[PDB]
Amino acid sequence: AYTNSFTRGVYYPDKVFRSSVLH
Amino acid sequence: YFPLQSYGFQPTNVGYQPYRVVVLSFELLHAPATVCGPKKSTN
């Protein structure tokens, strides 16, 4: 059986703070 | 046939003698630091 993972499973790639930025 | 073989560290062996080796490697990453030099912190 299956289901569609829409946008799930993104994670913070590194332990660095960033703000108001498209990385 | 055998895959594995041994050294033979007789004291009578210098290139054929056993050397101990340590390889220190440093985890530089963006996590909190935990292994640090003796350099004292200021105010």
Side-chain angles (χ1 to χ4, degrees), chain B residues 1-22:
Chain B
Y1 176 81
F2 300 98
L4 297 164
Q5 302 82 32
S6 90
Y7 295 93
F9 301 137
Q10 302 161 195
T12 56
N13 286 10
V14 177
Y16 300 97
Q17 294 179 9
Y19 270 54
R20 283 180 182 212
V21 57
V22 173

Side-chain angles (χ1 to χ4, degrees), chain B residues 34-42:
Chain B
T34 90
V35 184
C36 300
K39 197 176 193 173
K40 296 179 183 178
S41 57
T42 63

Side-chain angles (χ1 to χ4, degrees), chain A residues 5-21:
Chain A
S5 63
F6 308 118
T7 56
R8 292 283 157 195
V10 184
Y11 59 85
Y12 292 85
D14 54 8
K15 306 179 184 71
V16 173
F17 177 90
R18 301 186 184 83
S19 59
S20 307
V21 67

